[PDB]
Design goal:
Elements: H1 5-14, H2 25-36, E1 43-45, E2 51-53, E3 58-59, H3 89-99, H4 109-114
Antiparallel strand pairs: 1-2, 2-3
The structure holds vanadate ion (4 copies), chloride ion (3 copies) and sodium ion.
PDB class: hydrolase
Keywords: vanadium, POV
Entry title: X-ray structure of a polyoxidovanadate/lysozyme adduct obtained when the protein is treated with [VIVO(acac)2</sub>] in 1.1 M NaCl, 0.1 M sodium acetate at pH 4.0 (Structure C)
């Protein structure tokens, strides 16, 4: 599913991401924009052989099981395919784990490089949430 900006913001807020671990909703929407372009089906292989999955590009190196990431963990205790669903619940639940791990949203390199420090409120501007 390719979400619209305001549709995703509304879904993220419903699922409890707004100000989760202090990160305003626009941070989450910005991250998803640059990680996946709001496409729940996005997948991208990493150099180390892991893969990133879904709207928030969660990595098989640590967080989910895809059966082809040697030596990896599955800390969210899910199959990586679950992160590609049209319903964002599994991705949100896992993202809450990740953001709580110690480095906040710096876990998402696109967030640090493209969202951090910017006017992230723009991402939810005009939205009926
Ligand atoms: O997040 V709503 O669907 O106020
Ligand atoms: O395509 V991945 O480098 O962890 O974002
Ligand atoms: O021993 V278990 O971490 O799923 O509770
Ligand atoms: O309630 V679903 O979020 O699992 O629409
Ligand atoms: Cl957009
Ligand atoms: Cl694996
Ligand atoms: Cl933080
Ligand atoms: Na894994």
């Amino acid at each position: 599913k390719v979400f619209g900006r305001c549709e995703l913001a509304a879904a993220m807020k419903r699922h409890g991401l707004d100000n989760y671990r202090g990160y305003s909703l626009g941070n989450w929407v910005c991250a998803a924009k640059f990680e996946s372009n709001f496409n729940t089906q996005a997948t991208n292989r990493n150099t180390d052989g892991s893969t990133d999955y879904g709207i928030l590009q969660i990595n098989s190196r640590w967080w989910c099981n895809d059966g082809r990431t040697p030596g990896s963990r599955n800390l969210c205790n899910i199959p990586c395919s679950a992160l590609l669903s049209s319903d964002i619940t599994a991705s949100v639940n896992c993202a809450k784990k990740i953001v709580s791990d110690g480095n906040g949203m710096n876990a998402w390199v696109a967030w640090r490089n493209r969202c951090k420090g910017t006017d992230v409120q723009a991402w939810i501007r005009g939205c009926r949430l």
